[PDB]
């Protein structure tokens, strides 16, 4: 079977001095119009369809496995907020959810806030970006996208008679906050071209959208604009944030005249985020360390910040929650997430204990501070995702809801925390899981997942889909490679920019170790990763093709240099502090040397499935497309290279959820076939 050969159109870049010829630069089209591009993608999709056609039997098997353990009757965990209990209801034969609420003192009746299906009537796309009731519980602001271009139209509704307002606020990010008069909101506007949150406008609910005065214009290109509100309900915060630096202006939520009040001016490498409660500010700042500390102050002035939790080399401070008698904080240490409660008055401390070798715990939704009930999540590789409600005074823990998993008995699966000494001497943590009865050291197929970017952690949690693999001899693995945030800020900074090469080394080292230690079969080694995890993939294969038999590169970021050079591509402006700006010989040199597209050599590669989305936009469909074209011309091997490009538009990971389960069946079948 001859794979599709793309038309070679030489296009030289030439930056700083050295020239890169890109044969497949023409594959980029920002409108998705070009028939000649469409053809290559259709051709490549058609080839994929043909190669994977005998696996249909398995795909359907896996699809129904993964669907028949998920209740189509899905209610949420109800939360109280402003005296009303709020729940989301999914029911079969209905694509979008129904959001309901009831008086906190009420049981019998439930009121419909917004029905997605009703709003979806007569429209081609629907995605709910935001939904929040005004402080007085009379009005309902909602951020909806009826065109699905990641750009939301805010509308207001009166819950008394379910009547809507005249006006509609357009071109927003969906991020808004009510003022305490319940007739005035601030909202974040994107630019007409760049389409990145940079403007904050004040609207008076029921007035003209033209007469919505601009409040703040964020000039610095690298700074994302956001809107939070404090626990005190006193200040609406304008949270400016780049990847290293941050700034916070305050808006008086009680006065209808309030200009942004400078909290603490932005300083390079000082990331801070605030809250307000008990007539105090509570700040999480990295001014005295990478790992962050919690600080208290009467006013904004940085000098006046008292230290509550000083930064440490060994414990990352991730987040916090305020309550009447207790402070509760999110922390990591030794590759485990953990929680702590600290009494404001007494100073008493209580850790929350857990046996599991590979688990994740986190702070859940706690909107009302005046309670002794903490709400925190938990998940592991053997235990479904679970929400608990702990009484901070009595230590009594009640489980509010589990993840519902049918045809699943937990005792069938073993999990392990394995450390691996990397080439440079650094201990890299690993969270693996396998089926008890299928295991036999050195025979089992091995799937190594990894991300390792932005300081994002691949914390060991539960996966219902993963059971399809485990129940076929597989040992699924999470590699907590540098670039993620599993071992704190240091772990991220040691896996980005000039130390990005550590990410890929860490991945290869973990896989080799696990093979050497007999966790998996050395012939049937497989890997997988998405977006920045697809960058991981594209590099790993270039440098260590021998290791893996098969690969799944999801929506991969493989054309690193060219993409980061070209400003017109969105996301690029914020990612300068991640990979680097190749408008510097320094970063150009380093980035290029791992950049998977620039590093495609004429050698053997593993079996590979590259996936992408055309009309999703923020995937960059061409990066994988070009990458395959080049892999096809250069690779020396007989093994299969397939490119599936999604040609849809609507939905994503919910409502049109089943598309997401089709894609995983496609990929799992692919791997399973190779692993036979």
Author numbering: 2 to 677
Task: Reproduce, without paraphrasing, sentences from the article in which this PDB structure was first reported.
Two domains are linked by a hinge region that participates in the transition of the enzyme between two major states—closed and open—in which domains and residues of the catalytic triad are located close to each other and separated, respectively. The enzymes were crystallized in the presence of spermine and adopted uncommon intermediate states in the crystal lattices.
The partial restoration of the catalytic activity of PSPmod was also achieved by the alanine substitution of Glu125 acidic residue from the β-propeller domain: PSPmodE125A possesses hydrolysis efficiency toward the substrates, from 19 to 26%, of PSP, demonstrating increases in hydrolysis efficiency (kcat/Km) over PSPmod by about 6- to 9-fold. As a result, five, three and two bound Sp molecules were found in the structures of PSPmod, PSPmodE125A and PSPmodS532A, respectively. Sp701 is present in all structures, while Sp704—only in the PSPmod structure. The PDDF profile of PSPmod has an intermediate width and reaches the minimum value for PSPmodE125A and PSP-Sp. This is consistent with the minimum distance between the center of mass of the domains and the maximum value of the buried surface area found in the crystal structure of PSPmodE125A compared to PSPmod.
